[PDB]
Amino acid sequence: IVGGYTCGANTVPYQVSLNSGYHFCGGSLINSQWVVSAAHCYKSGIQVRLGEDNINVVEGNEQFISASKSIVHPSYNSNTLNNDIMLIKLKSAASLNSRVASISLPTSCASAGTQCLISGWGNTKSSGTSYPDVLKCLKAPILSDSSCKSAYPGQITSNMFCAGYLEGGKDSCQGDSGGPVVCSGKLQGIVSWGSGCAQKNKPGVYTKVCNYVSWIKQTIASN
């Protein structure tokens, strides 16, 4: 997260870290057994780390649980990044507590101008690299379709939205992928892609979760 702030320990209790010997993506817990992330975060041997604040120090209340299944959307496309959503099943149920809790799925889509909370352990620099120990947070508005399509000609589908600031300086960045965008207490977005990070007139692009609610429910039920 570029231009964000320290969330505060466990203030985003649905936020998880995906780990394969290093943190590589985020995710959001949606029930005790299932995490929503981005399909481009897919790989074998994912360990889900729940209840984290500082990902580089073990305090003892973290839960490290392997993914037993990682299911990309069947229409995911790695070129266009359309349908960039993935469901991870945990090998064992997470134990829910003050630091580990699920985020509600939306019942309706969000609209331009709505302020959302975006979080992650991603790069905090727009040029060069710096990775934080503790979880970072960013408040950002959903932008109009017009703003989004002007920024990303030919690249925006009905399954994406832009969020952020056209002046630059505030954005999600590498390491944030798969993490939450939460608007009025609902998971409306997944960190997906952009042209760099925090660049002028290049806001972050996010998977539009409200389009996938039925698919999520059916996939959870079937697996």
């Binding site: 290093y22 790695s78 070129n79 266009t80 960039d84 991603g122 590498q174 390491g175 042209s195």
Partner: peptide
């Protein structure tokens, strides 16, 4: 350029 926000980043069409 067009990149996913994973570590490491993956390219997108752009």
């Amino acid at each position: 350029g067009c990149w996913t926000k994973s570590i490491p980043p993956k390219p997108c069409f752009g």
